[PDB]
């Protein structure tokens, strides 16, 4: 529940996305109302979401996978 | 869930195990209006056309 940065290995190591996904995992680590299965869902949703905005993320110089 | 409460006690009244005094009241008032002529019309075949 508290160490959720094992799941960010398919994300950029440095950048805005990492800084954004280090806030999602800090808030999800402070959440006693979700299970671990539900917390990964959130993380997997952004991964699928940033894979579909690759063209928009190239304009802003972000190399997501 | 008003459905569950309203459907359970409707079934229990038809099975005879719950006596609703409110429906009886309005079952008798609707029975006394058929004798007085004030019966609900058939849909489509209304007073207007």
């Amino acid at each position: 529940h508290i160490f959720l940065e094992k799941h960010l290995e398919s994300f950029p190591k440095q950048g805005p996305i990492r800084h954004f996904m280090e806030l999602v995992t800090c808030g999800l680590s402070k959440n006693p109302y979700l299970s671990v299965k539900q917390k990964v869902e959130h993380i997997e949703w952004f991964r699928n979401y940033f894979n579909e905005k690759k063209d928009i993320l190239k304009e802003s110089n972000i190399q997501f996978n | 869930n008003h459905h569950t409460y309203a459907e359970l006690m409707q079934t229990l009244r038809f099975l005879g195990l719950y006596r609703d005094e409110h429906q009886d009241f309005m079952d008798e008032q609707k029975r006394l209006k058929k004798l007085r002529g004030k019966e609900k019309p058939k849909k489509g075949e209304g007073k207007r056309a």
């Binding site: 805005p16 954004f20 869902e41 949703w45 952004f46 905005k53 928009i56 304009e59 | 008003h2 459905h3």
Partner: protein, 101 residues
């Protein structure tokens, strides 16, 4: 078998707000920051506004559960002042008594 249509609309509203709760949360998170580019935040502003209006939680109204009264409702019992007093005046609400001091 709800009190009225006004109550029935809220029931649907509350059901549609529970289905899109997570989707709306994930999309707002992008908007509620100064980290991501405006280009991406502008695309999320169009995605959360295209969802059904009834998924928005600001349309949910806390009505009474017996008489569907929109105002004069007590949140702890989800009852209107009129229905609360009726049960309280008959000694049916544990602990509730009239105050004198």
């Amino acid at each position: 078998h709800y009190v009225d249509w006004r109550m029935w609309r809220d029931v649907k509203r509350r059901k549609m707000a529970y289905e899109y709760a997570d989707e709306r949360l994930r999309i707002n998170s992008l908007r509620k920051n100064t980290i991501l580019p405006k280009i991406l935040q502008d695309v999320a502003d169009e995605e959360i506004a295209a969802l059904p209006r009834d998924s928005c939680p600001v349309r949910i109204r806390n009505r009474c559960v017996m008489t569907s009264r929109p105002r004069g409702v007590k949140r702890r019992w989800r009852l209107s002042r009129i229905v609360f007093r009726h049960l309280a005046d008959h000694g049916q609400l544990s602990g509730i008594q009239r105050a004198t001091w």
